[PDB]
Amino acid sequence: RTINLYSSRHYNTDDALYDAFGEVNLIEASAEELIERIQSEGANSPGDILFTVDAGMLWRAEQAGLFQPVRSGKLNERIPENLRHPDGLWYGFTQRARVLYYSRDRVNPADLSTYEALADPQWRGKILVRPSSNVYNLSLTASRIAIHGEPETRRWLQGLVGNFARQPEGNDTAQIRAIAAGIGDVAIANSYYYIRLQKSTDPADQEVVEKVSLFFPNTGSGERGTHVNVSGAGVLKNAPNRDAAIAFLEYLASDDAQRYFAEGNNEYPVIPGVPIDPVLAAHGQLKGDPLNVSNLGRYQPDSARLMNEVGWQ
Ligand SMILES: [Cl-]
Ligand SMILES: [Fe+3]
């Protein structure tokens, strides 16, 4: 049982997941780089699976004609109707929330509400987010354009960029740490990164958790919900290990794999039969935005374009 896996995932604890399945050859790069590669390789690509951390990039790979369909009883039963492709071209295996983090010392959480409100001039020199090319931010801005239209997203972005603590650098975790070091006050980053810190024995990670808290945005009165994205995969069209590939997707939907995603990388499992991690549950029930995740991919070029325009570097 052996695959060639094209992964844009970036979690060292993922290795244990791959080993538990079988012989797994990793081809790891950014989703964009992986898509261009599968394309340039043509009918000769040895790739079996494309595993991303973004429904947007899944949507684009799917639009490009990269996935072959995979119907099976197990998948059909274990993956929610909305977190997958109707024809089964790809499946979402985890869910994750793009949340807000804030300084417990400098921020009153009664001041927080939405991503939108962060363009208020009251956050001059106070916001931390990672670079615009990142897929998480792409998706977020794309969902905003879907929901509010371009002019309003442009406005939000103009405002938000003006409120940057520094030129964006570092990953989601780096923005959480920067809050602790007092470089900024509020950060946009994914939920599961914070839970990792809460479980860490590292005294420096407890120092970040002691200083920084998680706030769910857009969950209040009249608000749509938290931006939720998904990590997912589908079988590539020229898979030389077609059988092993399907075995992998079903393996990702298995109690074991979902239990790993839940309590090893602190994401939200998608299958019934596995609980959300207690440390993640302690924060509250996830109130995610209903938006069809196809929008995330549909508005990606506009998102890239817009963030370029306002100067989000
Ligand atoms: Cl990705
Ligand atoms: Fe991540």
Side-chain angles (χ1 to χ4, degrees), residues 10-11 53 96 130 136 172 190 192-193 265:
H10 41 256
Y11 314 104
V53 288
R96 57 260 299 291
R130 81 196 289 182
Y136 300 150
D172 274 2
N190 286 350
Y192 56 84
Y193 285 119
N265 203 46

Coordinates of all heavy atoms in Angstrom, one line a residue, residues 10-11 53 96 130 136 172 190 192-193 265, ligand 2:
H10 N 1.7 21.3 6.6 CA 3.0 21.8 7.2 C 3.1 21.5 8.7 O 3.4 22.3 9.5 CB 3.1 23.3 7.0 CG 1.9 24.1 7.2 ND1 1.2 24.6 6.2 CD2 1.2 24.4 8.3 CE1 0.1 25.2 6.6 NE2 0.1 25.1 7.9
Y11 N 2.8 20.2 9.1 CA 2.7 19.8 10.5 C 3.6 18.6 10.6 O 3.3 17.6 10.1 CB 1.3 19.6 10.9 CG 0.4 20.6 10.5 CD1 -0.5 20.4 9.4 CD2 0.3 21.9 11.1 CE1 -1.4 21.4 9.0 CE2 -0.5 22.9 10.7 CZ -1.4 22.6 9.6 OH -2.3 23.6 9.2
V53 N -4.4 22.5 2.5 CA -5.0 23.1 3.8 C -6.0 24.2 3.4 O -6.3 25.0 4.3 CB -4.0 23.7 4.7 CG1 -3.2 22.5 5.4 CG2 -3.0 24.7 4.1
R96 N -11.2 24.1 10.2 CA -10.4 25.0 11.0 C -10.9 26.4 10.9 O -11.4 26.8 9.8 CB -8.9 24.9 10.6 CG -8.6 25.3 9.1 CD -8.4 24.0 8.2 NE -7.2 23.2 8.7 CZ -5.9 23.5 8.6 NH1 -5.6 24.7 8.1 NH2 -5.0 22.7 9.0
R130 N 0.0 37.4 9.0 CA 1.1 37.0 8.1 C 0.9 37.5 6.6 O -0.2 38.0 6.3 CB 1.1 35.5 8.1 CG 0.1 34.8 7.3 CD 0.0 33.4 7.6 NE 1.1 32.6 7.2 CZ 1.3 31.3 7.4 NH1 0.3 30.6 8.0 NH2 2.4 30.8 6.9
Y136 N -4.3 31.1 3.6 CA -5.3 31.3 4.7 C -5.9 32.7 4.5 O -7.2 32.9 4.6 CB -4.7 31.2 6.1 CG -4.2 29.8 6.4 CD1 -3.1 29.6 7.3 CD2 -4.7 28.6 5.8 CE1 -2.6 28.4 7.6 CE2 -4.2 27.4 6.1 CZ -3.2 27.2 7.0 OH -2.7 26.0 7.3
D172 N 1.3 31.9 11.2 CA 0.2 32.2 12.1 C 0.8 32.3 13.5 O 0.6 33.3 14.2 CB -0.9 31.2 12.0 CG -1.9 31.6 10.9 OD1 -1.8 32.6 10.2 OD2 -2.9 30.8 10.8
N190 N -5.2 30.9 12.7 CA -6.1 29.7 12.8 C -6.1 29.2 14.2 O -5.2 29.3 14.9 CB -5.6 28.6 11.8 CG -5.9 28.9 10.3 OD1 -6.6 29.9 10.0 ND2 -5.3 28.1 9.5
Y192 N -6.3 26.1 15.6 CA -5.5 24.9 16.0 C -4.1 25.2 16.5 O -3.5 24.5 17.2 CB -5.6 23.8 14.9 CG -5.0 24.3 13.6 CD1 -3.6 24.3 13.4 CD2 -5.9 24.8 12.6 CE1 -3.1 24.8 12.2 CE2 -5.4 25.3 11.4 CZ -4.0 25.3 11.2 OH -3.4 25.8 10.1
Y193 N -3.5 26.4 16.0 CA -2.2 26.8 16.3 C -2.1 27.1 17.8 O -1.1 26.8 18.5 CB -1.7 28.0 15.5 CG -1.4 27.6 14.0 CD1 -2.0 28.2 13.0 CD2 -0.3 26.8 13.7 CE1 -1.7 27.9 11.7 CE2 0.0 26.5 12.4 CZ -0.7 27.0 11.4 OH -0.3 26.8 10.1
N265 N -3.3 17.4 16.0 CA -3.1 18.7 15.4 C -4.2 19.7 15.7 O -4.2 20.9 15.2 CB -2.9 18.6 13.9 CG -2.2 19.8 13.3 OD1 -1.2 20.2 13.8 ND2 -2.7 20.3 12.2
Ligands
FE2 FE -1.7 25.5 9.1

